[PDB]
Amino acid sequence: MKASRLYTLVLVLQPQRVLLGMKKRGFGAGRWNGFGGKVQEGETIEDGARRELQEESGLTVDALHKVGQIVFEFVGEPELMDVHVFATDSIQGTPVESDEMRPSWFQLDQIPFKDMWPDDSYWFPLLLQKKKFHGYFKFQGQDTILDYTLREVDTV
Ligand SMILES: Nc1nc2c([nH]c(=O)n2[C@H]2C[C@H](O)[C@@H](COP(=O)(O)OP(=O)(O)OP(=O)(O)O)O2)c(=O)[nH]1
Ligand code: NA
Ligand code: NA
Ligand code: NA
């Protein structure tokens, strides 16, 4: 079984809107997403999530809730991406554009699925329903899912 590398993903989810960022370079460029990246040596996963949110959007938070975990496999890539997904409703500061991301708010009846990773269509609705989840998706390239599993869980 492949080795895995730890990543974070943070969704600022308010009652009528969600904050996403347009990825300007790198992995997932051209897609709207939450904020996140590789966990670094010595930090907890939650602290890595807080750090990435600050670096990519300028925001800080008073509390981060773990809402899901998704493992990604790409054909032809040796490592799995083990993504720990967090949400918060209560941020401090305004979002700012970074080298990585252009933040923008979306109303919750305008979630931009066509410009998001394809797997987000499956798990994002669970997030919105306050349901914790575990997932796994195998991709060929950026657009094609070959296999996936998704489970509602009581504990992430
Ligand atoms: N919504 C969504 N997010 C995903 C998927 N796959 C995936 O890795 N992610 C997230 C996890 C991370 O937030 C981000 C990938 O991390 P990254 O490449 O931006 O990491 P980084 O900031 O450390 O990278 P870099 O500056 O070194 O280029 O994308 C997916 O299918 N859907
Ligand atoms: Na980053
Ligand atoms: Na990133
Ligand atoms: Na999509």
Swiss-Prot record:
Q: Which residues hold Mg(2+) 1?
A: G36, E56, E100
| Biological-process GO terms, alphabetical | DNA protection; DNA repair; purine nucleoside catabolic process; response to oxidative stress
Q: What are the entry keywords?
A: Cytoplasm, Hydrolase, Magnesium, Metal-binding, Mitochondrion, Nucleus, RNA-binding, Transit peptide
**Top-rank lineage group of the source organism:** Eukaryota
Under the heading Pfam families, the entry gives: NUDIX (PF00293)
Which positions does UniProt annotate for 8-oxo-ATP binding?
A: F27, F35, G36, G37, K38, E52, E56, W117, P118, D119, D120
Please list the GO terms describing molecular function. 2-hydroxy-ATP hydrolase activity; 2-hydroxy-dATP hydrolase activity; 8-oxo-7,8-dihydrodeoxyguanosine triphosphate pyrophosphatase activity; 8-oxo-7,8-dihydroguanosine triphosphate pyrophosphatase activity; ATP diphosphatase activity; dATP diphosphatase activity; hydrolase activity, acting on acid anhydrides, in phosphorus-containing anhydrides; metal ion binding
Q: What is this protein called?
A: Oxidized purine nucleoside triphosphate hydrolase
Organism, as annotated: Homo sapiens (Human)
